[PDB]
Design a protein around this ligand. Structure first.
Ligand code: V9Y
Ligand code: V9Y
Ligand code: NA
Ligand code: NA
Ligand code: NI
Ligand code: NI
Ligand code: NI
Ligand code: NI
Ligand code: NI
Ligand code: NI
Ligand code: NI
Ligand code: NI
Ligand code: NI
Lengths: 174, 174, 174, 174, 174, 174
């Protein structure tokens, strides 16, 4: 057992390892989406750029969790990163909706990790979760919901004009 | 009675107190609208930004009136700020039309305050009204009417595409 | 029901709406006080400046809560902003004491909102409260208590010299 | 009883006073170690510099707690600062191990102070602990464990060459 | 079938998809290694930094292949990223040797992809491989072999002093 | 016995160890006072700032003595730092008078340490005392006496106005 461990339950250690796999999964989903919008029969550069940013952000999420595992004295165990459910993401609107489902899934996973940390009276772990994950999740969810709302009111996905313009006017400056 | 008072009728003092309450009311209306466009099921950032600016401007209007009350020797009496008529503002076009009605209401209130000041032969009060309120009202009214006209010719509120584009191209730079 | 809502109790939603009304109320109290010190028969510019700053800060508090309501998926409902208990604030010392009572009231309201969020196992809401409200309350309370102590040891409110000097030497640079 | 106190248990007040004494104790331990490495028969400048930094950091920890006591309305009571267990710290490796034991002790003390604050439903106190102490403890513990590991793999304390080189290559730039 | 495809065999398309999975695998291996050196019982920051750089470089390799797939008209199909063979990488020397085996594996895969492209008379694909992969592989292999040689001549992995010094003097500036 | 020792009596070594404990004691006294003026029922920021500066200066005094002990070949032995006589310092005037008593005590201790060094014909030790302690003591004593005189002529401690103004006009710029 390691010299820095203190107040660190094994249930928490397992949970962090599960969360690492989840954040890498999300990274892979977003990479898949990004390059779907790179296809010559979709060709929406700013959708592609948007989801590529999200994919690198989730990779950083995963790395912060791994640093945390080592900080608290736990051992990293890595597992396979399952492939996204889809290879074809249909449309900008549909990709954004899958991103909404994804982030809500990841959010309930964090909220249970927080439940877990408060119940094993691990306040350091709890505040780590609050400070570095919980509000980033709320922000990501509000943002993807704003986008789904605008794509819908424009006429997406029935109107290809709507997705083109959304790509130029909303994902062209941030 | 106060040492600086001169040529300041009590009807005018009451009127300024009424006008303070009105300008705070307008501030509250615009705050309500601003955050309606912040909702994830409306998501029009630049509408929200537009009405938030107007709300801070009306708060400054109110403060200038309070400074004026104290300048002329009158006493400030504050009252409740009634809630906006609506919690849901339907659409960008409808919000803009409510803003037009609002500013015309506030304008007739100022025009009667000016009537009042000219009839109690208070030229300082009269020129205060002309210089700091009357033309700001005419400008605000022309501006909101321009906007209602453009939203209508675009197809608002039936076309969600129209409101999206108006938010990007007219309220995105000023 | 809205697409971004997750782990957000309706008791919490109601509570945020109550807290918004409270922070706007505080804003109105401080505006009232500010312009009482602007009167020609009180004439304490730096008291006025002090309470005007506090009033704009409480308006920002309210806006942050409204942004939060929309972020978590809740609906904003606004209510009347009741008028301050007083129109005449007697003196700098008395105004400062009313400000102390006010901030303690607002603080117990936040502490119950936090109780509520921890009991509905809403850690995002809980950390929002800790990070953006709780310590600002402790700071505001210590500050107003320091001031009440100094005004008292100087001879306020019996000595008008004391309030004059406090206005020049303590509220003249910060 | 003081005018700023709210939601501040007397058990918490006592606890902060205990924690102040503990953080000053740690400061004294590190000062002792620092100047042990200053001895002409040890002469490891960067060990000395390392532990002197830690000693000033613990003094700042103590001061932040005292500011907090006064902020929440409590009264500071100071006690004797007991002398370090040792006057002779044997070696760089041994000093680092005593520093590891020390910080773990201080950490369990903070974790109980947090337990205490959550149980007396003092969220301001709880978030203070999370934000300003808990993660600084985890960082300090990981750091001292990294160092103990490297000194051991080098051949410390049997090899005086190992400690010399560690002092030059690990504690010579940070 | 897609409008940009020309001279692009389906065997090549499959091969690029296999190579994408391989470059992501390598990325995962290096991430695993990086954070093994982050452990408090290994604590070799510059090994960790070294393998983390390699892991981000392999992620860029994968992305360049995906861009290429879309450029030539092929369709991206993603698969699971299998976990590294080990969770514990034993030592700096052993990690470096696994990195050598890895890059040679990836290199023979590229050399067969090139064989394939020259035999389906796809010169664009062939020169892509030469310009963006083949020489990066030769460089990576020479580099890891240099390192394995130096760690061995120093006394690794039997001497923990050797790995410490290698981490400071060879992976501390590049 | 140590290789650098020359002309260094054991009575002197003991004396330096006593003086180290004394300078740390003074540091603790001043910290106690500083945070007494931080209390919300005293609230004299510049008194607090004044005594906090003095407390860090005495900590530096102690460290210079410890460096000197090691320089001359002596061994540092640390002891408990006794708590200040008081937890409540009554008033600015009273705190300043306790500071005067304190510095005179420390001064006679240095003057005996100098007596001791001249009698064991240790001129290096003697000039160290003259150059780094004796005149700093005379300066500190004149300064605290100036302050006690001004607080008294103002009406302290009977007049809380006097202490307020002294805090603003004498301890507000130096
Ligand atoms: O503008 C006027 N005063 O400034 C004014 C209004 C009505 C009359 C009047 O009585 N005309 O016969 O004058
Ligand atoms: O009594 C309880 N469960 O039945 C309980 C113990 C600790 C807590 C808690 O975490 N309060 O914030 O609740
Ligand atoms: Na927290
Ligand atoms: Na070529
Ligand atoms: Ni994430
Ligand atoms: Ni709890
Ligand atoms: Ni107006
Ligand atoms: Ni006329
Ligand atoms: Ni507030
Ligand atoms: Ni500490
Ligand atoms: Ni070297
Ligand atoms: Ni590669
Ligand atoms: Ni001294």
């Amino acid at each position: 057992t390691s010299q820095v461990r203190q107040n660190y339950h094994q249930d928490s250690e397992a949970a962090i390892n599960r969360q690492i796999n989840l954040e890498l999964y999300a990274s892979y989903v977003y990479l898949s989406m990004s390059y779907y919008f790179d296809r010559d029969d979709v060709a929406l550069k700013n959708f592609a750029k948007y989801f590529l940013h999200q994919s690198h952000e989730e990779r950083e999420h995963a790395e912060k969790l791994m640093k945390l595992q080592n900080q608290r004295g736990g051992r990293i165990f890595l597992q396979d990163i399952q492939k996204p459910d889809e290879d074809d993401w249909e449309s900008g609107l549909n990709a954004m909706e899958a991103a909404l489902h994804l982030e809500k899934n990841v959010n309930q996973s964090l909220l249970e990790l927080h439940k877990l940390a408060h119940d094993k009276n691990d306040p350091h772990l709890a505040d780590f979760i609050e400070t570095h994950y919980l509000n980033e999740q709320v922000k990501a969810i509000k943002e993807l919901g704003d986008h789904v709302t605008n794509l819908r009111k424009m006429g997406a996905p029935e109107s290809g004009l709507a997705e083109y313009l959304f790509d130029k006017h909303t994902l062209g400056d941030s």
